Amino acid sequence: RTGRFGPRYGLKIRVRVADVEIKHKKKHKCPVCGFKKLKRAGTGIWMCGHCGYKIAGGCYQPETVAGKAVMKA
Amino acid sequence: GRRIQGQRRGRGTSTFRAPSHRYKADLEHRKVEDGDVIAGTVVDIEHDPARSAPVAAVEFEDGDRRLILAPEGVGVGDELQVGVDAEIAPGNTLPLAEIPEGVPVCNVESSPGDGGKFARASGVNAQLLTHDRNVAVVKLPSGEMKRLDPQCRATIGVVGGGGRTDKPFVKAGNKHHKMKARGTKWPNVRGVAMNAVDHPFGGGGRQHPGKPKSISRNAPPGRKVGDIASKRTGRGG
Amino acid sequence: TGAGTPSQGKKNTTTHTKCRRCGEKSYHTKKKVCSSCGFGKSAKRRDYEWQSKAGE
RNA sequence: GUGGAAGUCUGUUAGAGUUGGUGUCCUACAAUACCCUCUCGUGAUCUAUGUGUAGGGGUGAAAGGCCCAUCGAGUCCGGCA
RNA sequence: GUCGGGUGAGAACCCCGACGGCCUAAUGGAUAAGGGUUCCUCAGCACUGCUGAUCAGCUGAGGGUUAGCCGGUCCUAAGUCAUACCGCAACUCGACUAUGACGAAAUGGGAAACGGGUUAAUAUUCCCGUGCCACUAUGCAGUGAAAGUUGACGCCCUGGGGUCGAUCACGCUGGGCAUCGCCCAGUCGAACCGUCCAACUCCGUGGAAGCCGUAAUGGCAGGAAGCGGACGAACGGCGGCAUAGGGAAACGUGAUUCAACCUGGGGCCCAUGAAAAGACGAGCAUAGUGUCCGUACCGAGAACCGACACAGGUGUCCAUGGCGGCGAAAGCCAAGGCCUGUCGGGAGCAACCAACGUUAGGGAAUUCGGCAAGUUAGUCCCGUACCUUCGGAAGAAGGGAUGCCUGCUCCGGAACGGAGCAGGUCGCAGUGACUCGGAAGCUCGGACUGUCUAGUAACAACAUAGGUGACCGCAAAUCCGCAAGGACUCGUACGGUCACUGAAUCCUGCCCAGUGCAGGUAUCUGAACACCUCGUACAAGAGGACGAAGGACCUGUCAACGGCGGGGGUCUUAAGGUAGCGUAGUACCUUGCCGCAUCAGUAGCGGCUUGCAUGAAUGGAUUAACCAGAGCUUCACUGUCCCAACGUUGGGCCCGGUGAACUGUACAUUCCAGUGCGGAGUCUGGAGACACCCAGGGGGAAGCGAAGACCCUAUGGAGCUUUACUGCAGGCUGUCGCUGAGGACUCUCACUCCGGGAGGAGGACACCGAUAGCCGGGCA
RNA sequence: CGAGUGGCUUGCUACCUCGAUGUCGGUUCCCUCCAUCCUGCCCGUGCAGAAGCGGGCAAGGGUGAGGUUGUUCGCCUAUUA
RNA sequence: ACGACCGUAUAGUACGAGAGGAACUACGGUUGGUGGCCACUGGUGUACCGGUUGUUCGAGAGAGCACGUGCCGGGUAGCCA
Ligand SMILES: [Cl-]
Ligand SMILES: [Cl-]
Ligand SMILES: [Cl-]
Ligand SMILES: [K+]
Ligand SMILES: [Mg+2]
Ligand SMILES: [Mg+2]
Ligand SMILES: [Mg+2]
Ligand SMILES: [Mg+2]
Ligand SMILES: [Mg+2]
Ligand SMILES: [Mg+2]
Ligand SMILES: [Mg+2]
Ligand SMILES: [Mg+2]
Ligand SMILES: [Mg+2]
Ligand SMILES: [Mg+2]
Ligand SMILES: [Mg+2]
Ligand SMILES: [Mg+2]
Ligand SMILES: [Mg+2]
Ligand SMILES: [Mg+2]
Ligand SMILES: [Mg+2]
Ligand SMILES: [Mg+2]
Ligand SMILES: [Mg+2]
Ligand SMILES: [Mg+2]
Ligand SMILES: [Mg+2]
Ligand SMILES: [Mg+2]
Ligand SMILES: [Mg+2]
Ligand SMILES: [Mg+2]
Ligand SMILES: [Mg+2]
Ligand SMILES: [Mg+2]
Ligand SMILES: [Mg+2]
Ligand SMILES: [Mg+2]
Ligand SMILES: [Mg+2]
Ligand SMILES: [Mg+2]
Ligand SMILES: [Mg+2]
Ligand SMILES: [Mg+2]
Ligand SMILES: [Mg+2]
Ligand SMILES: [Mg+2]
Ligand SMILES: [Mg+2]
Ligand SMILES: [Mg+2]
Ligand SMILES: [Mg+2]
Ligand SMILES: [Mg+2]
Ligand SMILES: [Mg+2]
Ligand SMILES: [Mg+2]
Ligand SMILES: [Mg+2]
Ligand SMILES: [Mg+2]
Ligand SMILES: [Mg+2]
Ligand SMILES: [Mg+2]
Ligand SMILES: [Mg+2]
Ligand SMILES: [Mg+2]
Ligand SMILES: [Mg+2]
Ligand SMILES: [Mg+2]
Ligand SMILES: [Mg+2]
Ligand SMILES: [Mg+2]
Ligand code: NA
Ligand code: NA
Ligand code: NA
Ligand code: NA
Ligand code: NA
Ligand code: NA
Ligand code: NA
Ligand code: NA
Ligand code: NA
Ligand code: NA
Ligand code: NA
Ligand code: NA
Ligand code: NA
Ligand code: NA
Ligand code: NA
Ligand code: NA
Ligand code: NA
Ligand code: NA
Ligand code: NA
Ligand code: NA
Ligand code: NA
Ligand code: NA
């Protein structure tokens, strides 16, 4: 998390860094199968180490609040 | 005095130019004779240097391979379709007319055939509101209501990479790197930190603009800095 | 770093060279243009009325 | 316990810089040098080679800095006795 | 450097031997650029060489660079050029679009060469031996042949394979030493041809419901381990090459750690890490061809740049030689190189100066200030405050240990790896040299890394993330161009332009009157064309009607420029200073008052505070970390001081050689007074004074150096500013032309844009040309 | 109130220098003046003594160390004839 | 080329109600200044001797280097305070 920032940058800057990157690094359930083997490949690029399914999602999360509103509509 | 920074830009010398040669693709919708039959497969998801968002590699039926402005949720193997009769799912492209009101779209053409102009950046999307035989009303990410020819093709879903703006750069070094993939001069020196000869706001024993910052629409280049034709400033009221 | 003596050391680049056209050592090999006769720029030879006094 | 992140630390590794000694020098070794001391040293890092931008114009993390010992407007010749 | 010796007319510095040193990422080895013959040989000394020279990078004359397989050449990169097109009064000018070409010698891609020999001087080029590539021809094979692979790629961590080297063990070969028995060197052998294959991937078998596996992550009924197999690597092993080569000789074997090279896994990106030619895909024999250009030497404290044989500057490879140690660190030492960072001789060698050692007692009393110097120091154990953004503070502080010798233990496969134990023992001192932090506290600033005045400023200044405001729907906002056109843009509001504030934390009040910006606007003002009246046989000209942008007028707007007082218990001019902070890096009075601290404190810190003249993104308060930033205190420390001494090295002084410059109206041995344009070696009066020379420290020559930077003067110059004067670009707006049909409207045909086209949008507007009004330090 | 001396302060003047007479403080080192702070000899005293106060001759010698401040000056401390 | 002070005797005396409290003169010392000298104390002493770390000469012996002594311990003469 943010601890690589030592005493630098401030509460708000690094707190948002830990927050974003904790969700960012959480176990993600792949769309294709159901397994939680989704990891971020790069900016906005996700994949599942299980079956290899590479997907297009959020920058730090594989799904965005707006990506979901799509499914419905 | 000397030309101010906004004037140096326009010359288009290396420093202000985008590293074009390093870019991947000019994302544009495909041109279809008609029929819609054009479909393809997502071969790969790559990173777009010019947009800092993901981009999908696609292989069309007639052999054409091209990168595409990718909607959130597209993956390898998926099938996309481009045409008047294209299915109505994420990743597909078809005129706003065939599209069902109330759906999130992206990469909307300003005029049919231009390949898409509006809503293309990270996580954005346009909103298709009204239909007609003459005008297709769309609400662009800025919030403005845009009247568009129903022939204008658009893509279903919201652009990929949402949430980018959410995480702070945290340190100069990060901006630095982002800024090296963009036609921009970075860092930026405040005008009040320059001399008289270099910028309308320069000079002075201390740092303060000389005149008021709101400037006229008619002010010529070299002098048009500060708050351009501001209808108001501050936050009060 | 001194702009004087110490900055003189890094000068091992070649620019002006013997000119194919005029024979003067003014053919800038990087610009491929001669600063003396204008070879590589003008078909006509570089020449100006200010190379001599006004009435001469 | 593992792991080995970082415009992270110490560091005359290489290399980059230039705080103090207001030392030495000051018809110099040198038209910006010497020595001791000191800063940085995985990064907005340093560097070679190639290449782009030209004079009221460039370039400038801005000191009116820099554009060949030349800069509040380079240099050459001309206007010019 | 010294002693000998050689040569020579002549020798400190040319050559030989010995002894003595210097260089260890360089003072060695190989090179890029740049130089251009400086390379080698012979003959020389008038020049050059910091002295000399028989020497030489000098002078003269001769000689020297050999390539199918090392570079270039070929390819493409940022980008450059040419031609076409278009612009321009025009071009040697100018952007776009097309086409073509250029664009990489260390250091991008890349068909193919190794070992040895040889010359005064070349060498993967010649010679000897062995091998390889491409193309073409003949012949056999082959119909396959272009999909695909390759070329071809970022940063960080890491495993495996593995050569050289180094080290360890033992043997052989040669050498050194001479109380021992040790110590040094060697022990070799290519390209290429053949062969072997770990890792990764995959197949069959198998059938795990908890096992498999790693340094770590991890894998699995969507099939784990195990077993069998396919594909598959090194500049690596093995065989050949090789009764080749090389060596005086032996011409070894094992092992560990393993640069090169090979091959895997993991992590990071608001950052995504070339392209093209070429190669493979796609066999073998035999033969022919393989042109052209580069190749000498230096590559630097004498061959490059810097006027010089300049203490400066200048890229790449050797990063594995030994001891040492954490180390590419210090110190010592090999190999290799050098005594050319090139003048010597003499004096116990004085004063004075440069670098430096040591100083008793005291211990910052020195000083603007502890400037300079000093103190501390490596490793391990113990232990560690306030504060804090919980990261940090922290190596806090403070305390203890530290060698050698003898015999051992533990981790590990092992190391010539690491951690411990017992006993013995010497010194003043065991990180024994070297290497190697002094510590603690208060206050200010800027949050942090970062940037800057090349050459007096490194800072509190710039930047920065973070906060905020403004403009814009893309035929946009913003910006360049005379134009043709262009940047932003392979971009699309989660964008990018234009500005302000400058991490976090708690906050950010009141004022729209002026100025600025923006919108509105009955009425007023408001130019030119066209129109109406007068005038003129026409024309000038006078007047009217209509009225755009702009302005008056109104509104919004301060994280827009800025402001937040006097008086009384409102007045100027809109409001009349809220949270804070406060004698401020802002406080005139001022050394403010009180306190702390000291023998004594214009300093510092705390409280107070009516603040000459604080205060909220002209950001306010505050704040951990950070800092060659500014002030202050304590412990420690010390030649900073009391107060100076002695010593070391290089000068200084004498001798040989070489050999400048600054400066000079003239005269000149001056001193004390006076006088003088009032600051005299020269005038006047007196005094003193024999001439020449050496050293010294600099009192005077208003000493030398620079036509004073300060000041004023000139109807001098330049940069900058603005509501100075006058103009100019540019923006907005009316009108005319392009321009067409039926004060409001429809259409389509020019014109513009979109679409590959068909066609779609827009449309007599827009663009462009002309003019008229407004704004107009952007510019002159 | 009146008369003066000095040339340390400050001001006035614009004579001297703008083809430059290097600034303030300090420091170091030298000579001087007396309008004398101490030291020697004196006079007076509201001089008992002691300690002073005022005055005269006298410049031989002395007149030191520190805390704040760039300070000159000055404030403060402890010694001191 | 000497300046000045302190201390003792004079004296708890003269003087003085008391408190307090001199002098002439003779002595001893200190301080600053001065000139000179090194028996003594102290400094230096890269003359010298020893201890010891690293490395090199194979060990030993005996030695070189570590900036003009590696460091540490001791130190004659001379020069000095
Ligand atoms: Cl950005
Ligand atoms: Cl070559
Ligand atoms: Cl692994
Ligand atoms: K003057
Ligand atoms: Mg595009
Ligand atoms: Mg932002
Ligand atoms: Mg970060
Ligand atoms: Mg850029
Ligand atoms: Mg800035
Ligand atoms: Mg400035
Ligand atoms: Mg200006
Ligand atoms: Mg400011
Ligand atoms: Mg400001
Ligand atoms: Mg210059
Ligand atoms: Mg760092
Ligand atoms: Mg460091
Ligand atoms: Mg460059
Ligand atoms: Mg300035
Ligand atoms: Mg020049
Ligand atoms: Mg020679
Ligand atoms: Mg010769
Ligand atoms: Mg080429
Ligand atoms: Mg190459
Ligand atoms: Mg040679
Ligand atoms: Mg050669
Ligand atoms: Mg030399
Ligand atoms: Mg002492
Ligand atoms: Mg003091
Ligand atoms: Mg210091
Ligand atoms: Mg074991
Ligand atoms: Mg030590
Ligand atoms: Mg800073
Ligand atoms: Mg400077
Ligand atoms: Mg600094
Ligand atoms: Mg500096
Ligand atoms: Mg700042
Ligand atoms: Mg911002
Ligand atoms: Mg900002
Ligand atoms: Mg105070
Ligand atoms: Mg202060
Ligand atoms: Mg405010
Ligand atoms: Mg006379
Ligand atoms: Mg003058
Ligand atoms: Mg002036
Ligand atoms: Mg002027
Ligand atoms: Mg077009
Ligand atoms: Mg002007
Ligand atoms: Mg003078
Ligand atoms: Mg008198
Ligand atoms: Mg006297
Ligand atoms: Mg003092
Ligand atoms: Mg020695
Ligand atoms: Na200003
Ligand atoms: Na952990
Ligand atoms: Na320095
Ligand atoms: Na100019
Ligand atoms: Na002229
Ligand atoms: Na010599
Ligand atoms: Na092999
Ligand atoms: Na080693
Ligand atoms: Na740093
Ligand atoms: Na206002
Ligand atoms: Na207003
Ligand atoms: Na204010
Ligand atoms: Na810094
Ligand atoms: Na000393
Ligand atoms: Na003199
Ligand atoms: Na100027
Ligand atoms: Na007088
Ligand atoms: Na006067
Ligand atoms: Na003069
Ligand atoms: Na002075
Ligand atoms: Na006297
Ligand atoms: Na004082």
UniProtKB/Swiss-Prot annotation, chain B:
Any one Gene Ontology molecular-function term assigned to this protein's record: rRNA binding
SMART domains reported for this sequence: Ribosomal_L2 (SM01383), Ribosomal_L2_C (SM01382)
Location of region: Disordered: 199-237
Subunit (UniProt): Part of the 50S ribosomal subunit. Forms a bridge to the 30S subunit in the 70S ribosome. Interacts weakly with protein L37Ae.
PANTHER family, alphabetized: LARGE RIBOSOMAL SUBUNIT PROTEIN UL2 (PTHR13691:SF16), RIBOSOMAL PROTEIN L2 (PTHR13691)
Species whose genome carries this gene: Haloarcula marismortui (strain ATCC 43049 / DSM 3752 / JCM 8966 / VKM B-1809)
Organism lineage: Archaea, Methanobacteriati, Methanobacteriota, Stenosarchaea group, Halobacteria
Family indicated by similarity: Belongs to the universal ribosomal protein uL2 family.
GO BP terms, alphabetized: cytoplasmic translation
Domain of life, per lineage: Archaea
Protein name: Large ribosomal subunit protein uL2
Note: This protein can be partially incorporated into E.coli polysomes in vivo, indicating it can replace the endogenous protein.
Biological role stated in the UniProt entry: One of the primary rRNA binding proteins. Required for association of the 30S and 50S subunits to form the 70S ribosome, for tRNA binding and peptide bond formation. It has been suggested to have peptidyltransferase activity; this is somewhat controversial. Makes several contacts with the 16S rRNA in the 70S ribosome.
Keyword annotations of the record: Ribonucleoprotein, Ribosomal protein, RNA-binding, rRNA-binding
Gene Ontology cellular-component terms listed: cytosolic large ribosomal subunit
UniProtKB/Swiss-Prot annotation, chain C:
InterPro entries reported in the protein's UniProt record: Ribosomal_eL37, Ribosomal_eL37/eL43, Ribosomal_eL37_CS, Ribosomal_zn-bd
Disulfide links within the chain: none
PROSITE patterns: RIBOSOMAL_L37E (PS01077)
SUPFAM superfamilies per UniProt: Zn-binding ribosomal proteins
Record region (Disordered): 1-25
Cofactor entry: Zn(2+)
GO cellular component: cytosolic large ribosomal subunit
Gene3D superfamilies per the UniProt record, alphabetical: 2.20.25.30
Highest taxon listed in the record's lineage: Archaea
Keywords of this entry: Metal-binding, Ribonucleoprotein, Ribosomal protein, RNA-binding, rRNA-binding, Zinc, Zinc-finger
Pfam families in alphabetical order: Ribosomal_L37e
Note on how the cofactor is bound: Binds 1 zinc ion per subunit.
Gene Ontology MF, one: zinc ion binding
Protein family (similarity comment): Belongs to the eukaryotic ribosomal protein eL37 family.
Function according to Swiss-Prot or TrEMBL: Binds to the 23S rRNA.
Subunit structure: Part of the 50S ribosomal subunit. Interacts weakly with protein L4.
Name the UniProt record assigns to this protein: Large ribosomal subunit protein eL37
Species for this entry: Haloarcula marismortui (strain ATCC 43049 / DSM 3752 / JCM 8966 / VKM B-1809)
